[PDB]
Amino acid sequence: YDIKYFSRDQRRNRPPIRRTVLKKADVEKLAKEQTFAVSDFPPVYLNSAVEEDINAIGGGYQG
Amino acid sequence: ALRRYPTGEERCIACKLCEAICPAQAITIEAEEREDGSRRTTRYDIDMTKCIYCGFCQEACPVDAIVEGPNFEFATETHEELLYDKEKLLENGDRWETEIAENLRSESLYR
Amino acid sequence: HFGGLKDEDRIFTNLYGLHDPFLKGAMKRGDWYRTKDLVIKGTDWIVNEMKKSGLRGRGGAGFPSGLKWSFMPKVSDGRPSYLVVNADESEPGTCKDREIMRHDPHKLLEGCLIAGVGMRATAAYIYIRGEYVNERKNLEKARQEAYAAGLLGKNACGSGYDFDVHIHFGAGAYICGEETALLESLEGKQGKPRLKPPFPANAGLYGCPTTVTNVETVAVSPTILRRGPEWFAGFGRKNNAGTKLFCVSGHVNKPCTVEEEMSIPLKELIERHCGGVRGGWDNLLAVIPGGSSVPLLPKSICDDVLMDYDALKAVQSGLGTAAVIVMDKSTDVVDAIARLSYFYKHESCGQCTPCREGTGWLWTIMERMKVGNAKLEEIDMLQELTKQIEGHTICALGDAAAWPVQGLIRHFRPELERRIRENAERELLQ
Amino acid sequence: RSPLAGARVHFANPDDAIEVFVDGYPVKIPKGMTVLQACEVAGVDIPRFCYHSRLSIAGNCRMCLVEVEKSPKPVASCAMPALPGMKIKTDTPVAKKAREGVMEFLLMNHPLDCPICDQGGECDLQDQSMAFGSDRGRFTEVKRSVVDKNLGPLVKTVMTRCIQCTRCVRFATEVAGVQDLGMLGRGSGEEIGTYVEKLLTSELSGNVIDICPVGALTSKPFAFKARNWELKGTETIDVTDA
Amino acid sequence: PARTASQQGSGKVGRWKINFLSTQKWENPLMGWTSTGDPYAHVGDSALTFDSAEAAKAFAEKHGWEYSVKKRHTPLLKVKSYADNFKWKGFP
Amino acid sequence: DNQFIFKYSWETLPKKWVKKMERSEHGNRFDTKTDYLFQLLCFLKLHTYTRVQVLIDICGVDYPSRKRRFEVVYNLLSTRYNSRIRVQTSADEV
Amino acid sequence: ALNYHLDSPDNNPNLPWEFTEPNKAKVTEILSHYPSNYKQSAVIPLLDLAQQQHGGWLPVSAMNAVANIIEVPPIRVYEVATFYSMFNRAKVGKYHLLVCGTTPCMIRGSRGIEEALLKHLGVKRNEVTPDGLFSVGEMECMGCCVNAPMITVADYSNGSEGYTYNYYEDVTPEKVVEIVEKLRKGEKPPHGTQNPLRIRSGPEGGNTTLLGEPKPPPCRDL
Amino acid sequence: SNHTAKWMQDTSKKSPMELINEVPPIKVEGRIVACEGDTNPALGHPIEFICLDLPEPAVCKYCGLRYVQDH
Ligand SMILES: Cc1cc2nc3c(=O)[nH]c(=O)nc-3n(C[C@H](O)[C@H](O)[C@H](O)COP(=O)(O)O)c2cc1C
Ligand code: SF4
Ligand code: SF4
Ligand code: SF4
Ligand code: SF4
Ligand code: SF4
Ligand code: FES
Ligand code: FES
Ligand SMILES: [Zn+2]
């Protein structure tokens, strides 16, 4: 009994696309401003095998 | 298959929602105003060699006119036999009306 | 503090019609005294007197009459310009214009002349509702008497002003009370109100500049002009000042129409001139202060509320036509508001979508909730529908239909809660 | 910001060009041209049911409501004249709520007969409901019903679908020149047509079905022959007249 | 393609199409369907949509087939007013 | 999500060939010139912090309106850093 | 059925309708009351005059006659007569009884008055009695709300002359029955309020205002 | 007639037009009806409201059943 679609219109309620034309001066400004640290590098998605028995999770029953 | 109302009139108005949604375009329909002003289809054919048996028409029907019946053992020796039309669809609906009605009740519960 | 007018300060001295309402009675009571001097004084002078008299529109809008008259074009263009006097009262609860026309018609005619002079109007049209036929006959006889005596026509008085007054009657439509709908009906079309990019002061009755003014304001114009704007501003308080005649109706002991000073307490108005509520003040449940347009008020607010434009607007309500309809504990306010919604649905013109369909939806919802066949979220939806109808409709009749339901939801919500819960319990039992 | 439908503005004189703001972007507009056409020049279209460019202006549907700054109530775009330095907005919550409410009120009494309605895929009520209106319906009570009218061998009338926009009442008055159609009645139930049995007869009578947004007036020879999406349209000229 | 006369929406205008004039459709003897023999029966109306007439001309010149551009017709906006809707007739 | 190596690339990648970039939740997008696409993909595949060492696919899109109708799109994945990247260029028939 | 014309051996366009001589004089006066080029403004008075002359209802013949007089297409007159409530387009009795029913009267006994009328006459809403003397209905608020429940009697017996749209206020069901009996017998009851203890639109018993003799205002120097 | 012979060639069984003409009109007390197709609204057609002011029977336009007002 509280139909109101302009608030739950998930299809059309999106912000407009923003465009910025960066020139040579802006590119040089960003290049000089930016710097790299040991903590700013992308994190690694690391994973490894464990060699775990089949009956280890819940005794093989729980599922 | 095509059904009918309990009175006996065709259940299918010519809304043309069948071929608007039929992904394989296996349904062709033409219509005109009847003698008493009712909107009825004067031509309604379905290719059983082009139908992908997907049920889009039977769920797009506003009046539950077209239904994909429970029958599946209708293998024919000729492609022309497999090319259905309105009279064959209507006689299929009349023949399988009771089972189609039972299935339609059970599934209209699930809707 | 306010109220208790004396017979000398009362404007409509023949309200109950105990004396002769014709020309001889009018002259005896003090009508057409110095109309020649008033017309000679000047249009700008009349407009200034109205502006500084504090007079406000008595038809419900409450707009200042002086400013509304000054909105007319000063330079006489090719178009003749017109005065129109709204005698078409159909809002439930109010019958003041009926008494004014029936018992003081010469006051109305002199007011038409004065307003036309002050607004540079060539002619005046008095739009009587079709139901009033005896009042129309009385006003016709008064107009013929005035024309024979020379009070109207080519020479209204010793002044050289040209003024002609005609009266046109409707055919039983509530929308025809609206200004633009009334102009359309007077044109001979259906009583469908216009929009408001063209104001009536620019393109009105026939595309000519016309001004639509209420009977009470136009009739009290000559009296306040003759007695001084200071005298009129003495009564009442602040902006809303003067003498207003209230029709007290409903479950009161002796319902009556009485002219009283503005800003009188509602309780004092009810229990001094009318007589009081049927079973005492404690028996009072809800009062609609104006006509059916404005939202109602419970007993709690009516204890101290003041009958004027501002206090009734300080609370979520309005003065409107200042015709109070009272309801004691015996009746059911839900059924009363359901009947009001039915009236509004019946009387909507049906040109604009939110009022053509929304009024019917409100009536059906109110009929359902009278028995109790509704839900809590359905009363919330009713409030939402009221809000949807209110601001998106061509004229103020959409507001007039939305307001009573909104007020009932705001004030008497627990009654609806109890009715819905009781009906749910009965349905579960059955 | 090209004008809507590539439309070209007609300036009576270059001196008269007021600068009106639509959705933040200002545009130049003639003096007397309304807010709806101002936004059309700006490039945004507003839903409309009782407005036709050739016909007159009426606020029958009350759906072209936009929020103009310094105004308590939503204003009708098709009727409010554009003033200099006026800030018009169409994507505000006020305008969206107004459109949704007006669509709900329009659809509360519309019959559930779109599949038999010949305006399937070309019905302004359907497209505007799917674009601006809500996806649900709060109405479940008794609808209204209207008996059909016989208006000749060309116009088939289903008056249950009529939204009473008076677009055809004033079409016969202004363009056709024969005053037979009319809005008669008062309130929620008001019918349209002729009081007496009067078949509408005019050379331009075929245009009445064209301007009807809903499937109220339809071509009788093309009653139920085909839908819109099926038909392929070729732009040609006529040879019956000169 | 011009705006449809049935409805006033203007979101399907401004696009340009190549109209392969392929009208060689007949009726199937067996089932009465609309047969064809031209590969370009529906591609121009279905898949080929161009941003502008210049783009359509460039495509036609690139692909070599002769073309003829049809001038598109555009509505003209004129001032309308509800005040002019209520005009005053002259004296009798 | 995982817009880490995309930003790191734009920080470290030479700016000569980055014709345009798009930061989207539908997929980070690089659009470059056809001359430098091989060098750009070689940099991304070999760099230690943008290791998109698996090529998901190559797609084509037809845009008849544009002068260069064909759009060649490369969807790449970095399993070491767990993120998808997109690099596209424009090519015509000849 | 109430917003379109269904042909009957009466009330069809083939029958001719025209005003009598006094009605023609009244039509001339009404037209003279309005500008010559705006004679359509007189459609409501002309329709009212036609309704009084034709026994209380407007036939399509009178509709067309009025449209011809005001020089407009008949559809405009049809619209005008259909829009307004007072214009009856179906046959009613010689006496049209109308009850209010609107809330200020409904909370005072309007529903009881209407049900008493229905029981006494034996007919339902908007249905003429089988004899044809009476026809009872209701409509929206009709003024004099403060004067208790009320009924209006439209008297279409003598025609255009002798037509009375009389009011009857402060009525009880017994008083309404008595008024109906008097109207059926042929004596015209005194219209107005029915309470002998009050003045028209005044408090019951003595008045509380305007007790003294009215005097001219002191006035103002002008 | 022509339409029935156009979509059907059996010309031995009863066409739906004849059956729907043979089913009698349905007399209803009220001025408006709700036409649903059968006893189960969910298994019929979209609800159609029919006005019955005209003397002649009114076809439902869905499952046409010719409802007629009582009096
Ligand atoms: C639904 C509705 C009912 C109205 N009823 C009346 C009425 O009974 N009397 C009246 O004078 N004006 C009526 N009007 C019009 C306004 O009151 C209008 O402001 C008035 O004609 C002129 O204002 P005034 O009070 O300054 O004279 C109505 C308007 C609407 C929208
Ligand atoms: S079930 Fe068959 S006929 Fe129906 S939509 Fe699917 S493919 Fe088409
Ligand atoms: S969807 Fe149903 S009613 Fe419509 S054409 Fe198909 S079978 Fe007929
Ligand atoms: S708000 Fe709309 S429907 Fe209501 S009376 Fe006014 S114009 Fe007519
Ligand atoms: S015009 Fe109305 S009845 Fe026809 S398909 Fe559109 S929304 Fe439905
Ligand atoms: S019939 Fe169509 S064009 Fe005419 S008023 Fe109704 S909806 Fe509008
Ligand atoms: S199009 Fe403007 S109100 Fe209808
Ligand atoms: S409420 Fe009955 S006369 Fe006004
Ligand atoms: Zn049905």
DSSP B66: B
CA distance B15 to B9: 16
State the burial class of residue E22 (Cβ atoms within 10 Å of its Cβ: 0-12, 13-18, 19+): middle
DSSP B10: B
Q: Which of F4, F94, F89, F91 is nearest to F39 (CA)?
A: F89
Q: Is the minimum distance from the CB of D76 to ligand 6 under 6 angstroms?
A: no
CA distance C412 to E62: 76
Contacts of E59 in chain F (CB under 8 A): 64
Helix/strand number for chain H, H first, E second? 2, 4
Q: Is the minimum distance from the CB of G44 to ligand 8 under 6 angstroms?
A: no
Read off the tokens for C376. 């809590």
DSSP D109: S
Read off the tokens for A47. 């994973």
Ligand 5, pocket residues at CB < 6 Å: D 110, 113-114, 117, 119-120, 123, 125-126, 161, 214-215
DSSP G120: H
Question: Closest Cα of chain D to B30: distance in Å?
Answer: 7
Report CA A10 to chain centroid distance, whole Å: 20
β-strand partners of B32: B40
B–D contact: 3+ Cβ pairs < 8 A: yes
Q: Which residues of D121-151 are buried (b: 16+ CB within 10 A; e: fewer)?
A: bbbbbbbbbeebbbeeebeeeebbbbbbbeb
Instruction: Cite the annotated binding site of H for Zn(2+) by residue number.
Output: 35, 45, 60, 62-63
Interacting residues of F67 by C-beta distance below 8 A, sequence separation 6+: E58, F92
Resolution (A): 3.2
DSSP G219: -
Read off the tokens for G169. 């206020």
Read off the tokens for G38. 């705006």
| Three-class secondary structure of residue E14 per DSSP | coil
Task: Check H46 against B104: CB less than 8 A apart.
Answer: no
CA distance E55 to G174: 89
Using left for φ > 0, alpha for ψ between -120 and 50, and beta otherwise, residue E18 falls in: beta
β-strand partners of F88: F31, F73
Task: Check C354 against D76: CB less than 8 A apart.
Answer: no
Question: Closest Cα of chain F to A34: distance in Å?
Answer: 8
CA distance G155 to G51: 11
Q: Is the minimum distance from the CB of G101 to ligand 8 under 6 angstroms?
A: no
Listing DSSP states for F43-93 in one string gives: HHHHSTTS---EEEEEEEEE-TTSSS-EEEEEEEEETTTTEEEEEEEEE--
Read off the tokens for C53. 């008299």
Contact between D227 and B20 under an 8 Å Cβ cutoff? The reply is: yes
Which stretch of DSSP H or E encloses residue H19?
Answer: helix H16-22
Polymer length in residues for chain B: 111
Tell how strand H26-28 and strand H67-69 pair up: parallel
CA distance A30 to E74: 48
CA distance A58 to D120: 59
CA distance C184 to D40: 31
Q: Which of C112, C119, C113 is nearest to C74 (CA)?
A: C119
Amino acid at C249: S
Task: Check F15 against A36: CB less than 8 A apart.
Answer: no
Q: Which of G150, G85, G96, G140 is nearest to G121 (CA)?
A: G96
Residue with tokens 């029907």: B61
Q: Which of C264, C257, C218, C209 is nearest to C241 (CA)?
A: C264
Angle A48-A52-A53 from CA coordinates, rounded to 5°? 160
| Three-class secondary structure of residue F31 per DSSP | strand
Contact between F67 and E62 under an 8 Å Cβ cutoff? The reply is: no
CA distance C185 to C191: 5
DSSP E73: P
Q: Is the minimum distance from the CB of C396 to ligand 1 under 6 angstroms?
A: yes
Q: Is the minimum distance from the CB of G105 to ligand 8 under 6 angstroms?
A: yes
- The experimental technique used to determine this model is cryo-EM
Q: Residue by residue, what is the 3-state secondary structure of A23-42?
A: CHHHHHHHHHHCCCCCCCCC
Q: Residue by residue, what is the 3-state secondary structure of chain C?
A: CCCCCCCCCCCCCCCCCCCCCCHHHHHHHCCCCCHHHHHHHCHHHHHHHHHHCCCECCCCCCCEHHHHHHCCCCCCCCCCCEEEEEECCCCCCCCHHHHHHHHCHHHHHHHHHHHHHHCCCCEEEEEECCCCCHHHHHHHHHHHHHHHHCCCECCCCCCCCCEEEEEEECCCCCHHHCHHHHHHHHCCCCCCCCCCCCCCCCCCCCCCCEEEEEHHHHHHHHHHHHHCHHHHHHCCCCCCCCEEEEEEEECECCCEEEEEECCEEHHHHHHHHHCCECCCHHHEEEEECCCCCCCCEEHHHHCCCEECCCHHHHCCCCCCCCCCEEEECCCCHHHHHHHHHHHHHHHCCCCCHHHHCHHHHHHHHHHHHHHCCCCHHHHHHHHHHHHHHHCCCCCCHHHHHHHHHHHHHHHCHHHHHHHHHHHHHHHHHC
Q: Which residues of G66-84 are buried (b: 16+ CB within 10 A; e: fewer)?
A: bbebbebebbbbbbbbbbb
β-strand partners of B80: none
How many A/F residue pairs have CB atoms within 8 Å?
A: 20
Q: Which of D174, D177, D156, D143 is nearest to D219 (CA)?
A: D156
Q: Which of C62, C93, C91 is nearest to C311 (CA)?
A: C62
Q: Which of A10, D231, D126, D165 is nearest to E9 (CA)?
A: D126
Give the nearest chain D residue to H58 (CA atoms).
D147
Contacts of D166 in chain C (CB under 8 A): 351
D138 → closest Cβ in A1, A5, A6: A1
Contact between D4 and E10 under an 8 Å Cβ cutoff? The reply is: yes
Report CA C262 to chain centroid distance, whole Å: 15
CA dist list (Å): B23 to B17, B53, B54, B55, D231: 12, 10, 9, 10, 18
Longest distance between any two alpha carbons in chain H, whole Å: 42
**How far is the centre of ligand 3, averaged over its atoms, from the C-alpha of G99 (Å)?**
52
Q: Which of C395, C336, C389 is nearest to C366 (CA)?
A: C336
Amino acid at C172: G
E–A contact: 3+ Cβ pairs < 8 A: no
CA distance D233 to D219: 17
Task: Check C195 against E87: CB less than 8 A apart.
Answer: no
Q: Which of E74, E84, E77 is nearest to D28 (CA)?
A: E77
| Ligand 2 atom, smallest distance to B56 CA | 5
| Ligand 4 atom, smallest distance to C393 CA | 1
CA distance H16 to B13: 13
| Three-class secondary structure of residue D41 per DSSP | helix
